[PDB]
């Protein structure tokens, strides 16, 4: 069985501030994190941004969301984007005020930052289970200094961020996770890990978990079989537990931009299809000794496509703000 049965619900506070209330499987209005907790979710992933101009996903935002997560009995995974806005393989902008010219200065800013985030959580008695040093960092982070022209710099920054967490006053130190996209692509994963470890600046002991994104709708090569091989290879090569920290499956996808992978093409687009997909993903992870799955943004009703070419990847119907049956998939898999 999976250790982490998770969801990323970072959008929740913004959706609430836009007037969204969610109706549960009992037909009752209920706080979204309590709906999840009562339906088998035991951990919540939260994106953190450094100095966003409108406050979205900033430190205060995340402290309040984490308090609610903890009140609901769930563990907290902080996904540090180390940017003022979305960090992904096509965007890794250095925060306003941080250095774009001096790697020594930037390394100290990253260290100070992750220490300050963690000590803010400690000071407020919020335990955190996992922290990622960056989001989807296969093409580096904190550009231009942390681009793939300078893997030596990337290693320094990861080292610094990780030790900021290790030096924090949290009573139990979080597991430190490194997160790359394209989890199904073993050669890409291997190239990154082998290269940052060879610099001499990142220690093999600096991180505890390897996390990957896994989506079915951006590339037909994303078969479950390739994911299985990649996860197996990651665990055996680097000696770290592995998990899927982002995934989605559509209830509606009328005009996909990319063909779906061959071993997933019989799964329907529906709530039942979401469950079948997740059940197969969970079995796949179990087979290989993987430890978690986090569903990405199940309740983001203003953004049902979640950035993909599909109409709707949510576990909540935007038309009536009511959860779909797939919201209980993790509980269903127990039982
Ligand atoms: C890191 O924080 C310390 C305060 O403990 C401060 O003295 C120092 O200037 C900071 N480093 C950078 C580069 O901002
Ligand atoms: Zn299972
Ligand atoms: Zn608010
Ligand atoms: Zn982007
Ligand atoms: Zn300097
Ligand atoms: Zn760049
Ligand atoms: Zn450069
Ligand atoms: Zn360099
Ligand atoms: Zn060091
Ligand atoms: Zn590749
Ligand atoms: Zn450590
Ligand atoms: Zn992503
Ligand atoms: Zn919204
Ligand atoms: Zn509906
Ligand atoms: Zn079910």
Short mmCIF file of C-alpha atoms and ligand atoms in Angstrom, two decimals:
data_model
loop_
_atom_site.label_atom_id
_atom_site.label_comp_id
_atom_site.label_asym_id
_atom_site.label_seq_id
_atom_site.Cartn_x
_atom_site.Cartn_y
_atom_site.Cartn_z
CA UNK A 1 0.00 0.00 0.00
CA UNK A 2 1.02 3.59 -0.74
CA UNK A 3 2.30 5.69 2.13
CA UNK A 4 1.07 8.98 0.60
CA UNK A 5 -2.44 9.21 -0.78
CA UNK A 6 -2.33 12.83 -1.82
CA UNK A 7 -3.79 15.86 -3.55
CA UNK A 8 -2.43 19.26 -4.49
CA UNK A 9 -5.15 21.78 -3.62
CA UNK A 10 -3.12 25.02 -3.70
CA UNK A 11 -5.91 26.89 -5.51
CA UNK A 12 -8.33 26.34 -2.64
CA UNK A 13 -7.98 29.71 -0.84
CA UNK A 14 -8.30 31.67 -4.11
CA UNK A 15 -11.34 29.63 -5.15
CA UNK A 16 -12.95 30.27 -1.72
CA UNK A 17 -12.19 34.00 -2.10
CA UNK A 18 -13.98 33.82 -5.49
CA UNK A 19 -17.12 32.48 -3.78
CA UNK A 20 -16.57 28.74 -4.35
CA UNK A 21 -18.09 26.38 -1.80
CA UNK A 22 -17.86 22.65 -2.45
CA UNK A 23 -20.60 20.06 -2.04
CA UNK A 24 -19.53 16.62 -0.82
CA UNK A 25 -20.78 13.06 -1.60
CA UNK A 26 -23.40 13.51 1.16
CA UNK A 27 -24.81 16.49 -0.71
CA UNK A 28 -23.55 18.84 2.06
CA UNK A 29 -21.42 21.96 1.80
CA UNK A 30 -18.08 21.21 3.43
CA UNK A 31 -14.55 22.58 3.49
CA UNK A 32 -12.64 20.94 0.62
CA UNK A 33 -9.74 19.63 2.74
CA UNK A 34 -12.25 17.86 5.04
CA UNK A 35 -13.94 16.29 2.00
CA UNK A 36 -10.57 14.88 0.96
CA UNK A 37 -9.60 13.73 4.45
CA UNK A 38 -12.93 11.90 4.84
CA UNK A 39 -12.42 10.21 1.49
CA UNK A 40 -9.04 8.66 2.10
CA UNK A 41 -6.55 11.42 1.27
CA UNK A 42 -3.82 11.62 3.94
CA UNK A 43 -1.41 14.23 2.58
CA UNK A 44 -1.66 17.58 0.81
CA UNK A 45 0.81 19.21 -1.55
CA UNK A 46 1.03 23.02 -1.63
CA UNK A 47 2.95 25.24 -4.08
CA UNK A 48 4.88 28.16 -2.60
CA UNK A 49 5.95 31.30 -4.46
CA UNK A 50 8.50 33.80 -3.15
CA UNK A 51 7.37 37.40 -3.79
CA UNK A 52 4.29 37.25 -6.02
CA UNK A 53 2.89 40.74 -6.56
CA UNK A 54 -0.69 39.75 -5.68
CA UNK A 55 0.25 37.44 -2.76
CA UNK A 56 -0.86 34.22 -4.53
CA UNK A 57 0.67 31.08 -2.97
CA UNK A 58 3.06 33.16 -0.80
CA UNK A 59 4.29 32.13 2.68
CA UNK A 60 1.32 33.48 4.63
CA UNK A 61 -1.10 31.91 2.12
CA UNK A 62 0.55 28.54 2.70
CA UNK A 63 0.68 28.77 6.48
CA UNK A 64 -3.10 29.17 6.57
CA UNK A 65 -3.73 26.36 4.08
CA UNK A 66 -1.30 24.09 6.03
CA UNK A 67 -3.07 24.85 9.33
CA UNK A 68 -6.28 23.65 7.77
CA UNK A 69 -4.60 20.57 6.28
CA UNK A 70 -3.15 19.69 9.72
CA UNK A 71 -6.52 20.31 11.44
CA UNK A 72 -8.02 17.81 8.99
CA UNK A 73 -5.50 15.19 10.08
CA UNK A 74 -3.37 15.25 6.91
CA UNK A 75 0.37 15.67 6.32
CA UNK A 76 1.91 18.69 4.57
CA UNK A 77 4.20 18.66 1.49
CA UNK A 78 5.66 22.08 0.62
CA UNK A 79 6.47 22.43 -3.08
CA UNK A 80 8.88 25.35 -3.21
CA UNK A 81 8.87 26.85 -6.69
CA UNK A 82 11.74 29.21 -5.82
CA UNK A 83 10.23 31.79 -8.15
CA UNK A 84 7.62 34.57 -7.92
CA UNK A 85 5.35 32.68 -10.32
CA UNK A 86 4.97 29.20 -11.93
CA UNK A 87 8.20 27.23 -12.13
CA UNK A 88 8.17 24.43 -14.73
CA UNK A 89 10.54 23.12 -17.47
CA UNK A 90 9.78 26.26 -19.51
CA UNK A 91 10.02 28.86 -16.72
CA UNK A 92 12.46 29.19 -13.82
CA UNK A 93 12.59 32.92 -13.14
CA UNK A 94 14.72 34.13 -10.27
CA UNK A 95 12.66 36.07 -7.71
CA UNK A 96 12.74 39.85 -7.81
CA UNK A 97 15.58 40.96 -5.52
CA UNK A 98 17.63 37.74 -5.74
CA UNK A 99 20.90 37.61 -7.64
CA UNK A 100 21.21 36.96 -11.36
CA UNK A 101 24.95 37.68 -11.41
CA UNK A 102 26.65 36.19 -8.29
CA UNK A 103 26.17 32.49 -7.47
CA UNK A 104 27.59 32.88 -3.93
CA UNK A 105 24.96 35.52 -3.16
CA UNK A 106 22.16 33.48 -4.72
CA UNK A 107 23.17 30.31 -2.82
CA UNK A 108 22.98 32.26 0.45
CA UNK A 109 19.57 33.72 -0.57
CA UNK A 110 18.21 30.21 -1.25
CA UNK A 111 19.56 28.92 2.06
CA UNK A 112 18.12 31.89 3.98
CA UNK A 113 14.79 31.49 2.19
CA UNK A 114 14.19 27.79 2.86
CA UNK A 115 15.36 28.22 6.48
CA UNK A 116 12.94 31.13 6.95
CA UNK A 117 10.03 29.17 5.38
CA UNK A 118 10.68 26.18 7.61
CA UNK A 119 11.23 28.23 10.77
CA UNK A 120 7.97 30.08 10.07
CA UNK A 121 6.19 26.72 10.03
CA UNK A 122 8.09 25.60 13.20
CA UNK A 123 7.26 28.81 15.06
CA UNK A 124 3.55 28.12 14.36
CA UNK A 125 3.71 24.45 15.34
CA UNK A 126 2.95 23.09 11.87
CA UNK A 127 4.82 19.84 11.19
CA UNK A 128 5.85 19.39 7.58
CA UNK A 129 6.38 15.99 6.04
CA UNK A 130 8.08 16.76 2.73
CA UNK A 131 9.75 19.79 1.13
CA UNK A 132 10.82 19.96 -2.53
CA UNK A 133 13.72 22.18 -3.45
CA UNK A 134 12.23 23.61 -6.61
CA UNK A 135 9.50 22.44 -8.97
CA UNK A 136 10.28 20.37 -12.13
CA UNK A 137 13.98 21.19 -12.10
CA UNK A 138 15.19 19.04 -15.00
CA UNK A 139 16.18 22.23 -16.88
CA UNK A 140 17.58 23.82 -13.71
CA UNK A 141 16.13 26.54 -11.52
CA UNK A 142 16.79 30.20 -10.74
CA UNK A 143 17.79 31.18 -14.27
CA UNK A 144 20.10 32.42 -15.48
CA UNK A 145 22.53 31.25 -12.76
CA UNK A 146 20.89 27.83 -12.36
CA UNK A 147 20.50 26.90 -16.04
CA UNK A 148 21.83 23.69 -17.53
CA UNK A 149 24.87 25.61 -18.71
CA UNK A 150 25.94 25.45 -15.05
CA UNK A 151 25.14 22.10 -13.43
CA UNK A 152 27.78 23.11 -10.84
CA UNK A 153 25.52 26.03 -9.94
CA UNK A 154 22.38 23.84 -9.96
CA UNK A 155 24.04 21.48 -7.46
CA UNK A 156 25.12 24.38 -5.24
CA UNK A 157 21.60 25.77 -5.15
CA UNK A 158 20.00 22.41 -4.41
CA UNK A 159 22.62 21.82 -1.70
CA UNK A 160 21.88 25.23 -0.17
CA UNK A 161 18.11 24.84 -0.26
CA UNK A 162 18.29 21.39 1.31
CA UNK A 163 20.52 22.55 4.19
CA UNK A 164 18.18 25.46 4.86
CA UNK A 165 15.58 22.82 5.63
CA UNK A 166 18.04 20.71 7.68
CA UNK A 167 19.00 23.75 9.79
CA UNK A 168 15.42 24.68 10.59
CA UNK A 169 13.86 24.28 14.02
CA UNK A 170 11.14 21.89 12.86
CA UNK A 171 11.05 19.22 15.60
CA UNK A 172 11.28 16.51 12.96
CA UNK A 173 13.19 17.46 9.81
CA UNK A 174 11.08 17.07 6.66
CA UNK A 175 12.01 14.58 3.98
CA UNK A 176 13.72 16.50 1.22
CA UNK A 177 12.46 15.79 -2.27
CA UNK A 178 13.85 16.58 -5.72
CA UNK A 179 11.18 16.83 -8.44
CA UNK A 180 11.57 16.36 -12.21
CA UNK A 181 8.94 16.29 -14.93
CA UNK A 182 8.62 13.37 -17.42
CA UNK A 183 8.90 10.59 -14.88
CA UNK A 184 8.40 8.02 -17.65
CA UNK A 185 11.63 9.13 -19.32
CA UNK A 186 14.46 7.24 -17.59
CA UNK A 187 17.30 8.62 -19.76
CA UNK A 188 16.29 12.21 -18.91
CA UNK A 189 16.05 11.43 -15.18
CA UNK A 190 19.41 9.62 -15.18
CA UNK A 191 21.20 12.38 -17.02
CA UNK A 192 20.10 14.95 -14.43
CA UNK A 193 20.83 12.96 -11.30
CA UNK A 194 24.17 11.58 -12.58
CA UNK A 195 25.31 15.06 -13.59
CA UNK A 196 24.42 17.03 -10.46
CA UNK A 197 25.89 14.26 -8.25
CA UNK A 198 29.17 14.36 -10.23
CA UNK A 199 29.77 18.06 -9.52
CA UNK A 200 30.91 17.34 -5.93
CA UNK A 201 28.69 20.07 -4.49
CA UNK A 202 25.44 18.12 -3.96
CA UNK A 203 25.75 15.34 -1.37
CA UNK A 204 24.09 11.97 -1.96
CA UNK A 205 22.59 12.41 1.50
CA UNK A 206 21.12 15.86 0.72
CA UNK A 207 17.78 14.46 -0.53
CA UNK A 208 15.56 11.63 0.71
CA UNK A 209 12.90 11.32 -2.00
CA UNK A 210 12.71 11.38 -5.76
CA UNK A 211 9.45 12.75 -7.10
CA UNK A 212 8.22 12.79 -10.69
CA UNK A 213 5.41 14.27 -12.71
CA UNK A 214 3.37 11.79 -14.74
CA UNK A 215 0.70 12.90 -17.22
CA UNK A 216 -0.95 10.93 -20.04
CA UNK A 217 -1.81 13.82 -22.34
CA UNK A 218 1.45 15.56 -23.46
CA UNK A 219 3.33 12.71 -25.14
CA UNK A 220 2.42 9.22 -26.37
CA UNK A 221 5.68 7.86 -25.02
CA UNK A 222 4.35 8.24 -21.45
CA UNK A 223 3.36 4.57 -21.16
CA UNK A 224 2.83 2.99 -17.74
CA UNK A 225 5.49 0.42 -18.70
CA UNK A 226 8.14 3.14 -19.21
CA UNK A 227 7.12 4.78 -15.94
CA UNK A 228 7.57 1.41 -14.23
CA UNK A 229 11.08 0.99 -15.66
CA UNK A 230 12.09 4.55 -14.82
CA UNK A 231 10.82 4.35 -11.21
CA UNK A 232 12.58 0.97 -10.74
CA UNK A 233 15.80 2.38 -12.12
CA UNK A 234 15.59 5.55 -9.99
CA UNK A 235 15.10 3.62 -6.75
CA UNK A 236 17.87 1.09 -7.55
CA UNK A 237 20.43 3.58 -8.97
CA UNK A 238 20.14 6.33 -6.36
CA UNK A 239 18.84 4.43 -3.33
CA UNK A 240 15.88 6.72 -2.68
CA UNK A 241 12.16 6.14 -2.34
CA UNK A 242 10.21 7.32 -5.33
CA UNK A 243 6.76 8.78 -5.87
CA UNK A 244 4.47 10.53 -8.34
CA UNK A 245 3.90 14.08 -7.11
CA UNK A 246 1.66 15.31 -9.96
CA UNK A 247 -0.81 13.56 -12.23
CA UNK A 248 -4.27 14.03 -13.82
CA UNK A 249 -6.80 12.12 -15.93
CA UNK A 250 -9.69 13.68 -17.91
CA UNK A 251 -13.42 13.25 -17.49
CA UNK A 252 -13.74 15.00 -20.85
CA UNK A 253 -11.17 15.39 -23.61
CA UNK A 254 -12.86 15.91 -26.98
CA UNK A 255 -9.84 17.00 -29.04
CA UNK A 256 -6.54 15.81 -27.52
CA UNK A 257 -3.44 17.53 -28.88
CA UNK A 258 -1.35 14.37 -28.44
CA UNK A 259 -2.16 10.69 -28.82
CA UNK A 260 -2.55 8.91 -25.45
CA UNK A 261 0.04 6.24 -24.59
CA UNK A 262 -0.64 2.75 -25.96
CA UNK A 263 -1.13 0.97 -22.63
CA UNK A 264 -3.67 3.62 -21.48
CA UNK A 265 -5.75 4.05 -24.64
CA UNK A 266 -8.58 1.72 -23.49
CA UNK A 267 -9.28 3.86 -20.39
CA UNK A 268 -12.37 6.03 -20.84
CA UNK A 269 -12.68 9.76 -20.22
CA UNK A 270 -15.04 9.80 -17.26
CA UNK A 271 -14.93 9.80 -13.47
CA UNK A 272 -14.80 5.98 -13.57
CA UNK A 273 -11.93 6.32 -16.06
CA UNK A 274 -10.06 8.55 -13.57
CA UNK A 275 -10.38 5.79 -10.98
CA UNK A 276 -9.24 3.06 -13.38
CA UNK A 277 -6.24 5.16 -14.34
CA UNK A 278 -5.32 5.88 -10.72
CA UNK A 279 -5.84 2.21 -9.71
CA UNK A 280 -3.45 1.12 -12.44
CA UNK A 281 -0.96 3.85 -11.49
CA UNK A 282 -1.16 2.74 -7.84
CA UNK A 283 -0.65 -0.90 -8.75
CA UNK A 284 2.29 0.13 -10.94
CA UNK A 285 3.87 2.02 -8.04
CA UNK A 286 3.16 -0.85 -5.64
CA UNK A 287 4.81 -3.32 -8.02
CA UNK A 288 7.98 -1.31 -7.87
CA UNK A 289 7.96 -0.32 -4.16
CA UNK A 290 6.97 3.32 -4.81
CA UNK A 291 5.42 5.22 -1.93
CA UNK A 292 3.00 7.85 -3.21
CA UNK A 293 0.67 9.55 -5.62
CA UNK A 294 -0.53 13.16 -5.52
CA UNK A 295 -3.47 14.06 -7.79
CA UNK A 296 -2.98 17.60 -9.13
CA UNK A 297 -5.66 20.26 -8.40
CA UNK A 298 -8.85 18.14 -8.24
CA UNK A 299 -10.99 21.16 -7.24
CA UNK A 300 -9.71 24.01 -9.42
CA UNK A 301 -13.16 24.80 -10.96
CA UNK A 302 -12.13 28.09 -12.70
CA UNK A 303 -9.44 26.11 -14.58
CA UNK A 304 -10.97 22.73 -15.39
CA UNK A 305 -8.48 21.94 -18.19
CA UNK A 306 -5.58 22.37 -15.75
CA UNK A 307 -3.37 23.68 -18.57
CA UNK A 308 -3.83 20.69 -20.85
CA UNK A 309 -5.73 20.39 -24.13
CA UNK A 310 -8.50 18.47 -22.34
CA UNK A 311 -11.71 20.22 -21.30
CA UNK A 312 -11.88 18.83 -17.77
CA UNK A 313 -9.43 16.98 -15.50
CA UNK A 314 -11.13 17.79 -12.20
CA UNK A 315 -12.84 15.68 -9.55
CA UNK A 316 -15.39 18.49 -9.08
CA UNK A 317 -18.00 19.63 -11.64
CA UNK A 318 -17.52 23.36 -12.26
CA UNK A 319 -21.21 23.75 -13.21
CA UNK A 320 -22.47 22.92 -9.70
CA UNK A 321 -19.33 22.85 -7.53
CA UNK A 322 -20.14 19.26 -6.52
CA UNK A 323 -17.53 16.52 -6.12
CA UNK A 324 -17.55 13.55 -8.52
CA UNK A 325 -17.30 9.96 -7.28
CA UNK A 326 -13.59 9.89 -8.20
CA UNK A 327 -12.98 12.14 -5.16
CA UNK A 328 -13.13 8.94 -3.04
CA UNK A 329 -10.77 6.90 -5.22
CA UNK A 330 -8.11 6.63 -2.49
CA UNK A 331 -10.63 5.42 0.08
CA UNK A 332 -12.12 3.04 -2.53
CA UNK A 333 -8.62 1.53 -3.06
CA UNK A 334 -8.35 0.90 0.66
CA UNK A 335 -11.45 -1.08 1.72
C1 LIG B 1 21.10 35.68 4.93
O1 LIG B 1 20.49 36.05 6.15
C2 LIG B 1 21.40 36.65 7.05
C3 LIG B 1 20.69 36.87 8.37
O2 LIG B 1 20.88 35.72 9.17
C4 LIG B 1 21.91 37.97 6.51
O3 LIG B 1 22.88 38.51 7.40
C5 LIG B 1 22.51 37.79 5.12
O4 LIG B 1 22.76 39.06 4.56
C6 LIG B 1 21.59 36.94 4.22
N1 LIG B 1 22.31 36.60 2.99
C7 LIG B 1 21.94 37.14 1.84
C8 LIG B 1 22.84 36.94 0.66
O5 LIG B 1 20.89 37.78 1.71
ZN1 LIG B 2 -2.85 -0.07 -3.24
ZN1 LIG B 3 -8.58 34.69 1.32
ZN1 LIG B 4 5.66 28.05 -17.61
ZN1 LIG B 5 30.12 37.41 -4.31
ZN1 LIG B 6 17.14 30.02 -18.93
ZN1 LIG B 7 25.23 31.47 -17.75
ZN1 LIG B 8 29.38 26.91 -14.17
ZN1 LIG B 9 28.05 22.25 2.04
ZN1 LIG B 10 14.19 11.08 -23.38
ZN1 LIG B 11 19.46 15.23 5.33
ZN1 LIG B 12 3.78 20.18 -13.33
ZN1 LIG B 13 -10.26 30.93 -9.52
ZN1 LIG B 14 -22.58 18.30 -11.87
ZN1 LIG B 15 -14.23 3.83 -6.77
#
